[PDB]
Amino acid sequence: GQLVQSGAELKKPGASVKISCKTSGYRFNFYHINWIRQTAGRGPEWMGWISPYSGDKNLAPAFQDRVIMTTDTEVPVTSFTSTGAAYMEIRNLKFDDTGTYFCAKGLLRDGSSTWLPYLWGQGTLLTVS
Amino acid sequence: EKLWVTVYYGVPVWKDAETTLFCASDAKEKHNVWATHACVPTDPNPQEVVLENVTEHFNMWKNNMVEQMQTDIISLWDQSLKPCVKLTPLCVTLNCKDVNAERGEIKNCSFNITTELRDKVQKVYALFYKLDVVPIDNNNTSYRLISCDTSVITQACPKISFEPIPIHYCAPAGFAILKCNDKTFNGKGPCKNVSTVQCTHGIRPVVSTQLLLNGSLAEEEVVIRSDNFTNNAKTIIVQLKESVEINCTRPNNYTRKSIRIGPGRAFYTMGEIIGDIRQAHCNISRAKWNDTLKQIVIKLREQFENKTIVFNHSSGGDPEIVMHSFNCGGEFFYCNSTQLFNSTWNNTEGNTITLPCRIKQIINMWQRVGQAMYAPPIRGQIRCSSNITGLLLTRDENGTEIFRPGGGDMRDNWRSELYKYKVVKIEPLGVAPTRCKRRGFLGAAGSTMGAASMTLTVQARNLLSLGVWGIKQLQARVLAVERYLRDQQLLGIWGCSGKLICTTAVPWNASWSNKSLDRIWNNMTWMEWEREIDNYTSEIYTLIEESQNQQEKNEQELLCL
Amino acid sequence: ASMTLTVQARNLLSLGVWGIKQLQARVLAVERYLRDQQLLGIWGCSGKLICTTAVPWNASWSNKSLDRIWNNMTWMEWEREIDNYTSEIYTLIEESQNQQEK
Amino acid sequence: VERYLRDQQLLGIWGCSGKLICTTAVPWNASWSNKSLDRIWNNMTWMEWE
Amino acid sequence: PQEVVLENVTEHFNMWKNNMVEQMQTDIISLWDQSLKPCVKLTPLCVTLN
Amino acid sequence: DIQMTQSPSSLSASVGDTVTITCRARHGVGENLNWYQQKPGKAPKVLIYMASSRQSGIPSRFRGGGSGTEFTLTISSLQPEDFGTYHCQQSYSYPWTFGQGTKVEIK
Amino acid sequence: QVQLQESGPGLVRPSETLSLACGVSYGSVDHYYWSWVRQPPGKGLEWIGYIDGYDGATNYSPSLKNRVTITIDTPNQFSLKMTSVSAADTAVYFCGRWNLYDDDHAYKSLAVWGRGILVVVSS
Ligand SMILES: *[C@@H]1O[C@H](CO)[C@@H](O[C@@H]2O[C@H](CO)[C@@H](O[C@@H]3O[C@H](CO)[C@@H](O)[C@H](O[C@H]4O[C@H](CO)[C@@H](O)[C@H](O)[C@@H]4O[C@H]4O[C@H](CO)[C@@H](O)[C@H](O)[C@@H]4O)[C@@H]3O)[C@H](O)[C@H]2NC(C)=O)[C@H](O)[C@H]1NC(C)=O
Ligand SMILES: *[C@@H]1O[C@H](CO)[C@@H](O[C@@H]2O[C@H](CO)[C@@H](O[C@@H]3O[C@H](CO[C@H]4O[C@H](CO)[C@@H](O)[C@H](O)[C@@H]4O)[C@@H](O)[C@H](O[C@H]4O[C@H](CO)[C@@H](O)[C@H](O)[C@@H]4O)[C@@H]3O)[C@H](O)[C@H]2NC(C)=O)[C@H](O)[C@H]1NC(C)=O
Ligand SMILES: *[C@@H]1O[C@H](CO[C@@H]2O[C@@H](C)[C@@H](O)[C@@H](O)[C@@H]2O)[C@@H](O[C@@H]2O[C@H](CO)[C@@H](O)[C@H](O)[C@H]2NC(C)=O)[C@H](O)[C@H]1NC(C)=O
Ligand SMILES: *[C@@H]1O[C@H](CO)[C@@H](O[C@@H]2O[C@H](CO)[C@@H](O)[C@H](O)[C@H]2NC(C)=O)[C@H](O)[C@H]1NC(C)=O
Ligand SMILES: *[C@@H]1O[C@H](CO)[C@@H](O[C@@H]2O[C@H](CO)[C@@H](O)[C@H](O)[C@H]2NC(C)=O)[C@H](O)[C@H]1NC(C)=O
Ligand SMILES: *[C@@H]1O[C@H](CO)[C@@H](O)[C@H](O)[C@H]1NC(C)=O
Ligand SMILES: *[C@@H]1O[C@H](CO)[C@@H](O)[C@H](O)[C@H]1NC(C)=O
Ligand SMILES: *[C@@H]1O[C@H](CO)[C@@H](O)[C@H](O)[C@H]1NC(C)=O
Ligand SMILES: *[C@@H]1O[C@H](CO)[C@@H](O)[C@H](O)[C@H]1NC(C)=O
Ligand SMILES: *[C@@H]1O[C@H](CO)[C@@H](O)[C@H](O)[C@H]1NC(C)=O
Ligand SMILES: *[C@@H]1O[C@H](CO)[C@@H](O)[C@H](O)[C@H]1NC(C)=O
Ligand SMILES: *[C@@H]1O[C@H](CO)[C@@H](O)[C@H](O)[C@H]1NC(C)=O
Ligand SMILES: *[C@@H]1O[C@H](CO)[C@@H](O)[C@H](O)[C@H]1NC(C)=O
Ligand SMILES: *[C@@H]1O[C@H](CO)[C@@H](O)[C@H](O)[C@H]1NC(C)=O
Ligand SMILES: *[C@@H]1O[C@H](CO)[C@@H](O)[C@H](O)[C@H]1NC(C)=O
Ligand SMILES: *[C@@H]1O[C@H](CO)[C@@H](O)[C@H](O)[C@H]1NC(C)=O
Ligand SMILES: *[C@@H]1O[C@H](CO)[C@@H](O)[C@H](O)[C@H]1NC(C)=O
Ligand SMILES: *[C@@H]1O[C@H](CO)[C@@H](O)[C@H](O)[C@H]1NC(C)=O
């Protein structure tokens, strides 16, 4: 499995950005896509969970207004593998939002720990200035 | 932490398989060529269970239902024709004269028929089509039946109707039929929206060449299907978005006469033609045909690069091979189909395309020799008014691709309807580790192993348990019973016959799968699990037989003492 | 009558006009027996002549005491009285018992 | 198939569907065979007994 | 022949709707046709007799 | 006239392997396709009759089949004696045309 | 075993008639389809035509029907007469026996072949 993110971007304060995350090597609709922020000045903190199967969303209270998550449908390549993508639109960038955003494939289809991220991407740098 | 083997019966896992399917229809006719008494009534409830989280690999070009349908279609035709008069004496030389109107198309032939009664040799006159009589000598007034020299011609019983009636194929016990619901499914590859059905939708067994009639329309656009597609040697099946109305007519009326052959049997032929001689022909709207080719060319351009597309007609030859064929009304029509595939697209001869047609009575059907059918003359004007629904194209060098009307054999029409169906064998026995020692059918097939065992009952409830077709169905039932009993004997030797989930006391070997239970009961589906340990299945089962049982049976014998 | 279930149980088993008809009759008898055994196996009664399930009796099926059921009535009369409700009872047995007990 | 199911039916009714050796509650009647267990088990073959 | 008399059993019979009659008639016709089928067909005898 | 093609037009294989030659019709012929083996400088002899029916005297190594327009000839356990040009012929309808032929060289 | 042998001129002019005979050794012209098939060098084979040994009935490929006549001469020999033979007609000509009776090994395949006579059209 592999998670691929778009390249780094420089944005002015007040601008919005939409960060894509493409998937391959596993079934896109079987696992959650987890968006997590690596804060340059504070450390990692959670942004949100999106389920491509049903569209269910779970945003952290801090980001309930800031984050809009969408997904496309999967396109199968084999019986156990498909490719796909998910998108996260972040509004109202401030200087405090500079950092690296990661997407990750969810650990399990069932069980108490389905939500946890397991296969992480490389991370996309967002610079605000 | 120590894990134990558990046997689950009714596991929603399947393998590709080739079997014999059941025939179902809407009971609503009698004396139909399709012998509807050999098929059962359908269930008004279509079933149709959507398989969530299941993507399956469909291949219309390897679909055994097509071969089964072709075999059944041939069998029904042979069964329908078997109890009919054979034209044994009609091999005599025929003295023919042309009928003056179709100049020379219909011949007035005088001939001498002997009978089994042998009261007299009788001289009769009859009308035949040019395609049925072959000149047997340099003399231009001697002719013989086209099929006489190779076989005895069997006359179709006039009571037999050739009208196509929808036929549904239904899964036998032990198997399931999957249907691909992807709107743009190309006939080969993964399908992401798969449902399980008991019976297919109705299939009209329309026998035609080059152009598909009636059938079903594409949901969104014209779809062009083939196997390798780059290979010239593949049939290209074009399913249209919208049908094109084709109005075929046989304007001649004729009259029908009976010439007795023997007790209770007669040859039915044409007597005198009433009215003018007018050519049989088909009318296809020109603008609609324009749109059909425009859409087909657009779809062809997407796969063959932006090359020039040329549609050519067939070469000259026997009309049964190179001309369009259909049989509406109980008459057999052959049309030229050359005013349709004569255009260059690269990148007004009226508003109606009128194709000439010819009528033939001796048909060598199903691409066979040694057998032939004589269609008795119908006595009226024959109207068709059918829907053209899809084309069969073939491909044959200065930057131009040449396409021609054509096809393989009748199986190419069945694929046109059967491209979305697959037949699979269900393998209800699965084995998995657990912690302790001693919706609908396939609804959880795409779900994880956990929460999919709670529906094993369904796979256990459903799925299990002098004519030639009757004997073949009897063999199918015996094989299904034997299969069920093989599963029950496997559970017996394992001591599992009394319940769906049987817990054993043989430890799980980490060499089979060195994974935690969360990695097994969650995350994976039953198919993925059965595949993961497929290479060890025969080993695992042996230990289930050898562990616990045998050792346990011996232990059981000494507990009384 | 419930003490003679085995007597009836033992009689469920055992190319011309008669050959094929006899073969069809034998296969159909096998299918009938196997279907009953499959229903019992789902219910978990395949090894039992009489088995008690977890499904309570609904008074709407028959508002009668056991003396009103086990005496006076024949098995024919009993099957007639609950014929219109028979399909409901089987559903509950599959819906409950093993489906949850497992 | 018919023979296998007849044997399985007989074992199912007796109460012996899962066993090769099955013990019942029916006492042995001396009128069937008035012999000690050693005279039977260590002398006769299964065919002579049957 | 077995023959077990059923105590306390009264059963409605109707000889005029008995499927056994239709089946026996079908079987007798089928057997007669199968028996006569592999025999001589007298087709050459449709001649005038003096 | 029904036009016939064949593929590959040039084939080679070592002794003991298994090879397939595919004969293709423009129009379906049912099962009425014959297969022949031609030795250089000699007339051909027939190997397979109605698509799958093998001639007596030809070992079971020669198998074949198919229906409609696409037919195959399979030669198992290829021998030095199998060197030559293979041909396919339609008997369904007149003229009984032939394919261009496949040359099989043994290495 | 029936054996066949082609006989005739090896060289024919571009404008004259080609005449090939096919003799039968251990047999005669029985009620089978006796036929001729052409094989140009480097090409596959094409049917010329056949004559049914039962009667005088013949059949020829439509593209050659107006130039080739196949007849039976002696009870043990039949022949192909092809008029107006062109340079393109240089080929190996084979005669043979085509089986049509189903109950034999061959149902429909040229079963008996001759040895083949190579005919060159030249001046
Ligand atoms: C008891 O045992 C003895 C010892 O084995 C038996 O003897 C064998 O008999 C068989 C039968 O003839 C014989 O096999 C033939 O050997 C010939 C050797 O030259 C082969 O030429 C011949 O092949 C032809 O016939 C086969 C059978 O039809 C075909 O499969 C094969 O393709 C050949 O067919 C050609 O000829 C037929 C003629 O009918 C023709 O239709 C075809 O078109 C084709 O032209 C056989 O293989 C063995 O050789 C004998 N063995 C020995 C050691 O001599 C004996 O037959 C047995 N006793 C009895 C009473 O049956
Ligand atoms: C097709 O495949 C997808 C995944 O590939 C399946 O979707 C998953 O479905 C499961 C079951 O619904 C989801 O599991 C989660 O279960 C939680 C509680 O149950 C689990 O945990 C308890 C205790 O921890 C265990 O006892 C129990 O056995 C389970 O392990 C829920 O609380 C979760 O709730 C979340 O989703 C629901 C859905 O509406 C929301 O209402 C909640 O707010 C919350 O967001 C959850 O249901 C699993 O997370 C799903 N995965 C994905 C990626 O969506 C489909 O079910 C499957 N289709 C079919 C037909 O089986
Ligand atoms: C849960 O499954 C995913 C998906 O892969 C499945 O499980 C694998 C163990 C293997 O059996 C695959 O065929 C299955 O499809 C596992 O995560 C990765 O999955 C890819 C395939 O998509 C596989 O090639 C990688 O090696 C796996 N990588 C890692 C680092 O594990 C995952 O591990 C499975 N188990 C969990 C989450 O517990
Ligand atoms: C997947 O296929 C199912 C059919 O099995 C589709 O569900 C049908 O959708 C149509 C939409 O008009 C409804 O009328 C049917 O009643 C539905 N049938 C069932 C059984 O649910 C489903 O929409 C398809 N999904 C896709 C293509 O994404
Ligand atoms: C076909 O030929 C038969 C006989 O050759 C024609 O029948 C004749 O029809 C005329 C009509 O006036 C009668 O007078 C004759 O007595 C008939 N002769 C016989 C022998 O029946 C018949 O009409 C011709 N039919 C067609 C369509 O040309
Ligand atoms: C019978 O018909 C044939 C075919 O036309 C003819 O050759 C023959 O002379 C006729 N015989 C009589 C007696 O009419
Ligand atoms: C043909 O198309 C018309 C379009 O209105 C439709 O009503 C008709 O039912 C179709 N007929 C068949 C046989 O599909
Ligand atoms: C398709 O045809 C080409 C023709 O060259 C061939 O090379 C290729 O292998 C074929 N592919 C398949 C999948 O049959
Ligand atoms: C056939 O008969 C019908 C009867 O209505 C008539 O209208 C029609 O014109 C006739 N056919 C010809 C070719 O005259
Ligand atoms: C077909 O079109 C022609 C155009 O001349 C017309 O005369 C004929 O009647 C039409 N046929 C039918 C069956 O509508
Ligand atoms: C075909 O006939 C129908 C009536 O049966 C008519 O409505 C339609 O317009 C005709 N179409 C053509 C193309 O002649
Ligand atoms: C194929 O099309 C070309 C023109 O592109 C034409 O000359 C040729 O005759 C056509 N083929 C046939 C068999 O008519
Ligand atoms: C189809 O019609 C064209 C009109 O020119 C004609 O040349 C051709 O021979 C016809 N084909 C057949 C097979 O009748
Ligand atoms: C193809 O169409 C053109 C234009 O109408 C016409 O001249 C030509 O004869 C047609 N070809 C055939 C084979 O009918
Ligand atoms: C489409 O049909 C119309 C009918 O008038 C005609 O003028 C036009 O040339 C045709 N075009 C094509 C591309 O076939
Ligand atoms: C099982 O066998 C298949 C070939 O049938 C092979 O590809 C696969 O790797 C094998 N798996 C194991 C675990 O040995
Ligand atoms: C006994 O059966 C009869 C049958 O008519 C019924 O009327 C009566 O109420 C029944 N008695 C009991 C106790 O169920
Ligand atoms: C036919 O039988 C009659 C006696 O009824 C006899 O007179 C006559 O000669 C017979 N015919 C022949 C041809 O022998």
Tab-separated table of N, CA and C in Angstrom, chain B residues 247-290:
chain	number	residue	atom	x	y	z
B	247	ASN	N	-38.377	-2.024	-40.033
B	247	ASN	CA	-39.688	-2.486	-40.486
B	247	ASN	C	-39.475	-3.370	-41.709
B	248	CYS	N	-39.474	-4.684	-41.502
B	248	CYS	CA	-39.274	-5.649	-42.576
B	248	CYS	C	-40.607	-6.230	-43.015
B	249	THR	N	-40.787	-6.341	-44.332
B	249	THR	CA	-42.036	-6.794	-44.920
B	249	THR	C	-41.766	-7.812	-46.021
B	250	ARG	N	-42.691	-8.772	-46.124
B	250	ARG	CA	-42.744	-9.773	-47.187
B	250	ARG	C	-44.082	-9.535	-47.879
B	251	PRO	N	-44.146	-8.637	-48.866
B	251	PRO	CA	-45.460	-8.212	-49.381
B	251	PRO	C	-46.256	-9.311	-50.064
B	252	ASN	N	-45.620	-10.372	-50.549
B	252	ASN	CA	-46.347	-11.405	-51.273
B	252	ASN	C	-47.249	-12.198	-50.334
B	253	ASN	N	-48.448	-12.533	-50.818
B	253	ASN	CA	-49.432	-13.282	-50.040
B	253	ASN	C	-49.286	-14.797	-50.183
B	254	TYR	N	-49.240	-15.294	-51.418
B	254	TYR	CA	-49.217	-16.725	-51.721
B	254	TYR	C	-50.432	-17.472	-51.179
B	255	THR	N	-50.420	-18.790	-51.421
B	255	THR	CA	-51.465	-19.702	-50.897
B	255	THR	C	-50.727	-20.967	-50.456
B	256	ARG	N	-51.317	-21.786	-49.584
B	256	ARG	CA	-50.571	-22.968	-49.077
B	256	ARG	C	-51.300	-24.251	-49.489
B	257	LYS	N	-50.567	-25.214	-50.057
B	257	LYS	CA	-51.196	-26.481	-50.520
B	257	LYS	C	-50.545	-27.681	-49.825
B	258	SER	N	-51.326	-28.734	-49.570
B	258	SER	CA	-50.816	-29.944	-48.941
B	258	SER	C	-50.730	-31.076	-49.954
B	259	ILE	N	-49.543	-31.657	-50.084
B	259	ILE	CA	-49.293	-32.802	-50.949
B	259	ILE	C	-49.014	-33.968	-50.010
B	260	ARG	N	-49.890	-34.967	-49.995
B	260	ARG	CA	-49.753	-36.048	-49.028
B	260	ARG	C	-48.526	-36.897	-49.334
B	261	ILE	N	-47.772	-37.235	-48.286
B	261	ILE	CA	-46.561	-38.039	-48.423
B	261	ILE	C	-46.848	-39.470	-47.997
B	262	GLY	N	-47.700	-39.623	-46.997
B	262	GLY	CA	-48.003	-40.912	-46.437
B	262	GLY	C	-49.149	-40.753	-45.471
B	263	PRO	N	-49.552	-41.836	-44.808
B	263	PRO	CA	-50.704	-41.757	-43.900
B	263	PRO	C	-50.479	-40.695	-42.834
B	264	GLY	N	-51.396	-39.735	-42.768
B	264	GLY	CA	-51.328	-38.737	-41.723
B	264	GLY	C	-50.244	-37.693	-41.877
B	265	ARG	N	-49.563	-37.625	-43.025
B	265	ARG	CA	-48.432	-36.721	-43.204
B	265	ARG	C	-48.469	-36.087	-44.585
B	266	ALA	N	-48.056	-34.822	-44.659
B	266	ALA	CA	-48.046	-34.105	-45.925
B	266	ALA	C	-46.931	-33.076	-45.967
B	267	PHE	N	-46.537	-32.760	-47.193
B	267	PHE	CA	-45.614	-31.689	-47.518
B	267	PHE	C	-46.437	-30.435	-47.788
B	268	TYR	N	-46.080	-29.326	-47.143
B	268	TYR	CA	-46.792	-28.063	-47.305
B	268	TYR	C	-45.961	-27.144	-48.185
B	269	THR	N	-46.529	-26.724	-49.315
B	269	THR	CA	-45.812	-25.871	-50.254
B	269	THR	C	-46.726	-24.782	-50.786
B	270	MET	N	-46.132	-23.869	-51.542
B	270	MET	CA	-46.880	-22.778	-52.145
B	270	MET	C	-47.559	-23.250	-53.422
B	271	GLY	N	-48.786	-22.790	-53.640
B	271	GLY	CA	-49.582	-23.136	-54.797
B	271	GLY	C	-49.479	-22.045	-55.843
B	272	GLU	N	-50.418	-21.101	-55.851
B	272	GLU	CA	-50.444	-20.010	-56.815
B	272	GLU	C	-50.266	-18.703	-56.056
B	273	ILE	N	-49.508	-17.786	-56.641
B	273	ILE	CA	-49.294	-16.474	-56.042
B	273	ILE	C	-50.481	-15.571	-56.349
B	274	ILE	N	-51.029	-14.945	-55.309
B	274	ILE	CA	-52.172	-14.045	-55.427
B	274	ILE	C	-51.643	-12.619	-55.364
B	275	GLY	N	-51.949	-11.832	-56.390
B	275	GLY	CA	-51.457	-10.474	-56.477
B	275	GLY	C	-50.136	-10.351	-57.204
B	276	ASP	N	-49.597	-9.138	-57.136
B	276	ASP	CA	-48.356	-8.809	-57.816
B	276	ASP	C	-47.165	-9.428	-57.094
B	277	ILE	N	-46.059	-9.538	-57.823
B	277	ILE	CA	-44.792	-9.984	-57.258
B	277	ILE	C	-44.026	-8.742	-56.830
B	278	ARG	N	-43.763	-8.634	-55.529
B	278	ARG	CA	-43.076	-7.492	-54.947
B	278	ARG	C	-41.953	-8.004	-54.058
B	279	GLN	N	-40.817	-7.317	-54.103
B	279	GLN	CA	-39.641	-7.747	-53.360
B	279	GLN	C	-39.801	-7.530	-51.859
B	280	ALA	N	-39.415	-8.539	-51.078
B	280	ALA	CA	-39.356	-8.387	-49.631
B	280	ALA	C	-38.257	-7.392	-49.288
B	281	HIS	N	-38.505	-6.536	-48.298
B	281	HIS	CA	-37.532	-5.487	-48.013
B	281	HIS	C	-37.675	-4.987	-46.586
B	282	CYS	N	-36.641	-4.280	-46.126
B	282	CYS	CA	-36.613	-3.713	-44.779
B	282	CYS	C	-36.366	-2.216	-44.858
B	283	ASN	N	-37.073	-1.454	-44.025
B	283	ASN	CA	-36.905	-0.008	-43.918
B	283	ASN	C	-36.290	0.369	-42.577
B	284	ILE	N	-35.144	1.052	-42.628
B	284	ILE	CA	-34.449	1.574	-41.454
B	284	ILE	C	-34.348	3.088	-41.606
B	285	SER	N	-34.747	3.825	-40.570
B	285	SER	CA	-34.655	5.281	-40.622
B	285	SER	C	-33.204	5.702	-40.834
B	286	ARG	N	-32.980	6.598	-41.799
B	286	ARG	CA	-31.615	7.008	-42.121
B	286	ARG	C	-30.999	7.876	-41.027
B	287	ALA	N	-31.749	8.839	-40.484
B	287	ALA	CA	-31.177	9.730	-39.475
B	287	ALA	C	-30.794	8.966	-38.212
B	288	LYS	N	-31.618	8.001	-37.818
B	288	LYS	CA	-31.303	7.239	-36.620
B	288	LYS	C	-30.070	6.380	-36.855
B	289	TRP	N	-29.948	5.815	-38.056
B	289	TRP	CA	-28.754	5.050	-38.387
B	289	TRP	C	-27.524	5.957	-38.406
B	290	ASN	N	-27.678	7.195	-38.899
B	290	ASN	CA	-26.581	8.160	-38.845
B	290	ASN	C	-26.098	8.312	-37.416
